[PDB]
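Quick illustration for those who missed Monday's session on complexes.
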Amino acid sequence: GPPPRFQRDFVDLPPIRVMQWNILAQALGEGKDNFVQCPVEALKWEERKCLILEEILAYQPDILCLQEVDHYFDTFQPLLSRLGYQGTFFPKPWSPCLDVEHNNGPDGCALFFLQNRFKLVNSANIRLTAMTLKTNQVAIAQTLECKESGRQFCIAVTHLKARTGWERFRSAQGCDLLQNLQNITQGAKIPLIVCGDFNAEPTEEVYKHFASSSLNLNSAYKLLSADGQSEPPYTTWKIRTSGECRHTLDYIWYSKHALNVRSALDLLTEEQIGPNRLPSFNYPSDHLSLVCDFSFTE
Ligand SMILES: NC(=O)C1=CN([C@@H]2O[C@H](COP(=O)(O)OP(=O)(O)OC[C@H]3O[C@@H](n4cnc5c(N)ncnc54)[C@H](OP(=O)(O)O)[C@@H]3O)[C@@H](O)[C@H]2O)C=CC1
Ligand SMILES: [Ca+2]
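Prediction with NDP bound:
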């Protein structure tokens, strides 16, 4: 069928468009994930590189928050720079990509913004800790200033520890991240948007901490549901040796009292995604991109 970027629609709910995407590290896609039903030819870097850029070009985001970026310096930083994006990259200290014999270096988080829209006010590369234990996961938090209005806001991207058995570990990481954002936003004086692959479904403690934080954060993709009270049924969908995995791990959190969600990019239906799920010949990651338009209240 056609590329998913031709199937997904924006639900209507100087806007700022934020895109959240775990793009699937090249070294991990070929060497560790064991996508037993995705053809190997669809995982080639040249094919994936082109599909990732096409997704970004389709949605023309003002802010791009990425995880699992192992081709920052050779691909995404130079190419997106030519399109007007300023980039920041922060690698995991011990990336699993380094376990692959022909990898392209460590993966990590990246944060891109359109230079002609925003001025960079401050930036922090945060190594997440779990009750003071130094972990292998990271966050980037930047304060930006709108060059037209003068409004400042904070954008953060993170990637938490994966897999079952790390629920308490993820909760501690999230608490550290929230603690950092408390400091950077001066007690919610600055509006906040947090993008990440939290590697946790809404039933996990880490989700509840974000949902009950005094930062007053809402999850943007809940607004796709009828009453706006439920997270989407999935943000990642693939088939491993272990079995078919379909769950919600990706979120865009936002200051409920300071930002309004104007739109959200809808999900694929079961019929549209195809029997072989993601990734595929027409989509380069096992996670769907999340895209929302925000506006400042009043
Ligand atoms: N540098 C070196 O020399 C050595 C590296 N290692 C270590 O391996 C460790 C792994 O790194 P870490 O950051 O903790 O990675 P995580 O445990 O947090 O996640 C594993 C990565 O593969 C994806 N994934 C999800 N489910 C599975 C699965 N069932 N099987 C395989 N992959 C899956 C995940 O994506 P998603 O988020 O979407 O779920 C994720 O990106 C590192 O600490 C590294 O130091 C091991 C030996 C030597
Ligand atoms: Ca992955």
